[PDB]
Amino acid sequence: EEKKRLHLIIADAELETVPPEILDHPAIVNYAKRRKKRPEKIILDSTYHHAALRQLEDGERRGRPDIVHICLLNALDSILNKEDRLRVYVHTRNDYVIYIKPETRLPRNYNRFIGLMENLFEKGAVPEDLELLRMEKKTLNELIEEINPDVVFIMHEEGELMIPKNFGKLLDKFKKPTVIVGGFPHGDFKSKVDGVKISLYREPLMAWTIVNEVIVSYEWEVIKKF
Amino acid sequence: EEKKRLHLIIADAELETVPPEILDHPAIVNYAKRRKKRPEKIILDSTYHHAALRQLEDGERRGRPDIVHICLLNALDSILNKEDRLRVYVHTRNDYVIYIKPETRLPRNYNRFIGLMENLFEKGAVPEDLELLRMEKKTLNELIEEINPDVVFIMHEEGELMIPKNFGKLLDKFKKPTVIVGGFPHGDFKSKVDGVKISLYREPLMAWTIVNEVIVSYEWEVIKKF
Ligand SMILES: O=S([O-])[O-]
Ligand SMILES: O=S([O-])[O-]
């Protein structure tokens, strides 16, 4: 744990269980009933729960765990991860952090991945001995503190523009660079932290695109074989 | 349509509706019943339909449309696509091809994406005027013929090894390079076609990883701005 790795935080993620406010909205009960599960245990998924988000704060961007799924399948199956050059983290829109042991194989199927998330929030670490996934109350600065990185990059549409190629060459110049990708469909970050704001393109991109640009550009810089 | 683009075929994809053989397996009926849908219209998804695949040929690798979903979200939201430098295609394990108009926004949520696939197989092109997705009976060579490419690359674990960086520099040396990524969890290709066999890493990678390596490496070569 002295080699150059990328610490990659999927921040302000729209990954949460059903909000208390709407546990008794019809759509939440009818869904909870069909799925034979206590509503407060269920992961909020706008695709099913839209009719219950109409009146909720930030309701239109919330309950998009899909974004996380695709970002993790991207990160964890990366060559970069296979070479032991990536720690990936998830910080949620409710200031919970998820630590992810590199060797973790996420479910390829979305609905198994959701099943896993429901577990993780219930038990707090899964599975029981291994704790490949572990979750606890934590702000993003508290998390950044733990990492103790020598640079922080905030992937943001309004940042200093870079060719992806070049960002990679930049990340290689540090020992423990953190990069923060928003885990949310649209809008600005909620957590404001210190960090360098970087745009990799002009028009806005989705989290996973950002993830894949960032990881590959480092890969060809940090992986010596390349 | 004279500029350098990458023609990217997701081949031999485990995307099909329920096979005729198992339309009357309990698990298929109970699922079809709950989802109030005629079994033969449903997209085969092993995560739900495993108990019905035990005795089916190739049953253990079949019904993984997830792999396609993640590969398309990767491809279509790529910068490469935004710059009009990518045609993406899907050829299935049942010799059907899906043409995908670049501007297409795939559902981010897996289960909406499945809904769309059920549609596409039913109506044959969706939506009705736009036909952003269009599907017809077609082998892979028949498809490769239509493309009329000046080189064919087959992403394969047992191929000539390349640094991804370098493959990109290679793809740029052609006008209309096709690259073929297997749309299946494991095993060898079913369709055998002419093409150069390329491995980007040693240990095996998932389709999307391959897709993301391939697209980004071309991006930094073909996109002049980069
Ligand atoms: O990872 S499992 O969902 O195929
Ligand atoms: O693309 S829709 O499923 O969010």
UniProtKB/Swiss-Prot annotation, chains A, B:
* Function per UniProt: Methyltransferase involved in ribosomal biogenesis. Specifically catalyzes the N1-methylation of the pseudouridine corresponding to position 914 in M.jannaschii 16S rRNA.
Q: Which residues form a coiled coil?
A: none
Note the SUPFAM superfamilies from the entry.
alpha/beta knot (SSF75217)
SUBUNIT field:
Homodimer.
What keywords are annotated for this sequence in UniProt? Methyltransferase, Ribosome biogenesis, RNA-binding, rRNA processing, rRNA-binding, S-adenosyl-L-methionine, Transferase
Enzyme class at the top of the EC tree = transferase
Residues reported to bind S-adenosyl-L-methionine: G182, G187, L200, Y201, R202, E203, P204, L205
The organism's place on the tree of life at top rank: Archaea
The family note in this entry says: Belongs to the class IV-like SAM-binding methyltransferase superfamily. RNA methyltransferase NEP1 family.
Q: Which Pfam families match?
A: EMG1
Recorded catalytic reaction(s): these are: a pseudouridine in rRNA + S-adenosyl-L-methionine = an N(1)-methylpseudouridine in rRNA + S-adenosyl-L-homocysteine + H(+)
- Per the UniProt record, the site (Interaction with substrate rRNA) maps to R64, R105, R108, R112
Q: Which InterPro entries match?
A: Alpha/beta_knot_MTases (IPR029028), Rbsml_bgen_MeTrfase_EMG1/NEP1 (IPR005304), Ribosome_NEP1_arc (IPR023503), tRNA_m1G_MTases_N (IPR029026)
Gene Ontology BP annotations? rRNA base methylation
Taxonomic lineage of this organism? Archaea, Methanobacteriati, Methanobacteriota, Thermococci, Thermococcales
The residues annotated as site (Stabilizes Arg-65) are D66
Could you tell me what this protein is called? Ribosomal RNA small subunit methyltransferase Nep1
Organism, scientific name: Pyrococcus horikoshii (strain ATCC 700860 / DSM 12428 / JCM 9974 / NBRC 100139 / OT-3)
Could you tell me the EC number(s) of this protein? 2.1.1.-
User: Could you give a GO molecular-function term held by this entry?
Assistant: rRNA (pseudouridine) methyltransferase activity
